[PDB]
């Protein structure tokens, strides 16, 4: 499976920029985004059951983001709104067939990512 | 030293599709980012399409994703961008770029530049 990520770039602080992941190559499984800020570790941001319902976002984004797919279409969307300086960030799209293994990331496939950088 | 030699692009009536191509030849490296920015009239470059070369994952602008493929063949250091339902404002000087690091890849000015293809788009 091979993924395919779009979006992402400058932003002022409080703007919006919206990204979207599509994989390509199980009917349902998780998808969405990590993030890694310079310095720190990589980190869950949102998640979405393709083929599901069930969503996750970590608590530093909720409210402020919001995660959506077109199963048809195997794609998920991080609409990415009141944006901070502490989101600048590489964003990784990245699936896993279960939702539990996701949340870990060790057993993801990971896309190379987008810049994020919030001004 | 890298060069990157560029091919396709030209002219095209609104809703019609070009092919662009890029092959890098010289110092490689086992991975590397690979694909194109364009200069749309009046703005400055700008990322379109970038592929891992070597590898698999692919990024798009928001504005192309769906109507432009990019893909590779990894052996002869080559990439393509297949640009389907072209619009007026895809109109651009298209330039080949290259990266070793993908993320770096995305601000440009670090990176290796081809010439650049022209791309117009008629009504």
Same mark, same amino acid.
């Given at each position: 499976?091979?993924?395919? $990520?779009?979006?992402?770039?400058?932003?002022?602080? =409080?703007?919006?920029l919206?990204?979207?992941?599509?994989?390509?190559?199980?009917?349902?499984?998780?998808?969405?985004?990590?993030?890694?800020?310079?310095?720190? $570790?990589? $980190?869950?941001?949102?998640?979405?059951?393709?083929? =599901?319902?069930?969503?996750?976002? *970590?608590?530093?984004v909720?409210?402020?983001?919001?995660?959506?797919?077109?199963? *048809?279409?195997?794609?998920?969307?991080?609409?990415?709104?009141?944006?901070?300086? $502490?989101?600048? *960030?590489?964003?990784?799209?990245?699936?896993?067939?279960?939702?539990?293994?996701?949340?870990?990331?060790?057993?993801?496939?990971?896309?190379?990512?987008?810049?994020?950088?919030?001004?």
């Open positions: 499976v091979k993924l395919e $990520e779009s979006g992402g770039g400058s932003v002022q602080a =409080g703007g919006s919206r990204l979207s992941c599509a994989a390509s190559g199980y009917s349902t499984y998780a998808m969405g985004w990590f993030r890694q800020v310079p310095g720190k $570790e990589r $980190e869950g941001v949102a998640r979405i059951n393709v083929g =599901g319902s069930s969503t996750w976002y *970590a608590d530093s909720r409210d402020r983001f919001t995660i959506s797919q077109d199963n *048809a279409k195997n794609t998920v969307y991080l609409q990415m709104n009141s944006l901070k300086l $502490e989101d600048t *960030a590489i964003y990784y799209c990245t699936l896993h067939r279960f939702a539990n293994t996701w949340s870990l990331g060790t057993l993801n496939v990971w896309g190379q990512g987008t810049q994020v950088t919030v001004s």
